[PDB]
Amino acid sequence: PPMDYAGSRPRLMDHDVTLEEIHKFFVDYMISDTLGVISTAHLVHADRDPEKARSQKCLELANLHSRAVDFAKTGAPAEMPYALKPREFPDFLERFEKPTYISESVFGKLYRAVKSSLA
């Protein structure tokens, strides 16, 4: 069964916009914007543990990703936890500075095959 699509409650002001709150929202979009890191963390976590996309970690990651996608329409920050960060990256990424670990999943097999083909 698919995940629920129930979004966050809308935030309605008691007065009209004074052209300053829109600027505050625009500036605040730069901070607490974890849209790009949630997908990478989910991919890394799915690569690491077996029976991927079945544990509660993947469900929480999907919920956070949906909330972050909905952040553009409703002002609800994603609030990415610190303990959910990957801290490890597979071989098929451009994060050379970050620690790189050998991946043994289907993506790792594809990367090994393409490396053997190009070499």
Partner 1 sequence: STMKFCRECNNILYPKEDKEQKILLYACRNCDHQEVADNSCVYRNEVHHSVSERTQILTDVASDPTLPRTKAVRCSKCQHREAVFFQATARGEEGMTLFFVCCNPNCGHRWRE
Partner 2 sequence: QREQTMSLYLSEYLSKKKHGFEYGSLEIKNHLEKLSFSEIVSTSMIIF
Partner 3 sequence: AILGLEFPYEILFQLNALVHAQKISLFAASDMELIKILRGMSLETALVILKKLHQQSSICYDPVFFVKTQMASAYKRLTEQNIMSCQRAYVTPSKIYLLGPELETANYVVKNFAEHVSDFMRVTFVEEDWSKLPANALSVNSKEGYFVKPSRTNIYNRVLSILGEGITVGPKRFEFLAFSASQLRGNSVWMFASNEKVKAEDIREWMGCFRKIRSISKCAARMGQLFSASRQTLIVRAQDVEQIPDIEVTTDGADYCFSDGIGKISLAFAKQ
Contact 41, 85 (CB under 8 A): yes
Q: Which is closer to partner 2, CB of 4 or CB of 97?
A: 4
Stretch that binds partner 2, among 4-12, 48-56, 79-87, 95-103 (CB under 8 A): 4-12
We find the least distance from the C-beta atom of residue 6 to partner 2, in angstroms, to be 6
We find the least distance from the C-beta atom of residue 29 to partner 1, in angstroms, to be 17
37 burial via Cβ count (<10 Å: 0-12, 13-18, 19+): middle
Interaction of residue 24 with partner 1, rule CB under 8 A: no
Interaction of residue 11 with partner 1, rule CB under 8 A: yes
Place of tokens 């007065």: 15
The dihedral built from the CA positions of residue 91, 95, 101 and 103, taken in this order, carries a sign that is negative
Stretch that binds partner 3, among 69-77, 88-96, 97-105, 106-114 (CB under 8 A): 69-77
Q: Which does 1 bind (CB under 5 to 8 A by kind): partner 1, partner 2, partner 3, none?
A: none
Q: Which is closer to partner 2, CB of 47 or CB of 65?
A: 65
